[PDB]
């Protein structure tokens, strides 16, 4: 139940073998994340700062509780 | 005439003020580049390794000569 990574379109867009596991392709932890109760402006600022489009949202124990994307904005 | 940076869609996609200069928004050098005469395989390997969609090509003296993009592939 621990957030171990994140796998997006850039990771899979050139992989010819579609039978590979996620572990070989994913971006492993640590990640750029935000805590629970993050506002829209804070998430947008983080995304603009780190030049990313996704933002996992974790609790105080480091467990995954939410996800934010640029698609929302 | 020096290759001082690169500016892409991620840099500009949340800049409300369109009158800003390029320098205030661009990604400054050094950049992930390749040498002249780089094959398609090497360029694709660089793009996959660094998770980027562009690749400037400079000469032996560091002056910009060309560009490679994922659009080509
Ligand atoms: N929060 C994050 N922390 C760390 N790495 C991340 C994070 N979000 C995305 N990445 C990684 O950054 C790279 C690209 O990020 P992003 O998710 O914006 O790409 P994408 O949505 O696949 O892009 P495109 O839509 O242009 O194909 C990928 O390798 C992805 O795994
Ligand atoms: N060769 C490079 N070296 C270093 N940084 C780069 C290079 N090419 C692009 N970047 C930077 O990486 C970020 C995203 O790279 P990329 O050029 O793939 O984005 P993009 O094509 O705008 O993405 P999207 O498809 O999500 O709109 C931007 O901040 C951009 O300035
Ligand atoms: Mg995207
Ligand atoms: Mg995109
Ligand atoms: Mg893209």
UniProtKB/TrEMBL annotation, chains A, B:
* List of residues binding Mg(2+): 53
Binding site residues for ATP 1: 54, 69, 71-72
Question: Can you give the residue ranges of the CBS domain?
Answer: 26-73
**Residues that, per the record, bind ATP 2:** 8-11, 27, 32, 53-54
Positions of GTP binding? 54, 71-72
Q: In UniProt terms, what function does this protein have? A: Catalyzes the conversion of inosine 5'-phosphate (IMP) to xanthosine 5'-phosphate (XMP), the first committed and rate-limiting step in the de novo synthesis of guanine nucleotides, and therefore plays an important role in the regulation of cell growth.
Note the subunit structure: Homotetramer.
The similarity annotation says:
Belongs to the IMPDH/GMPR family.
What name does UniProt use for this protein?
Answer: Inosine-5'-monophosphate dehydrogenase
Shown part of the complete sequence: 148 to 220 of 513
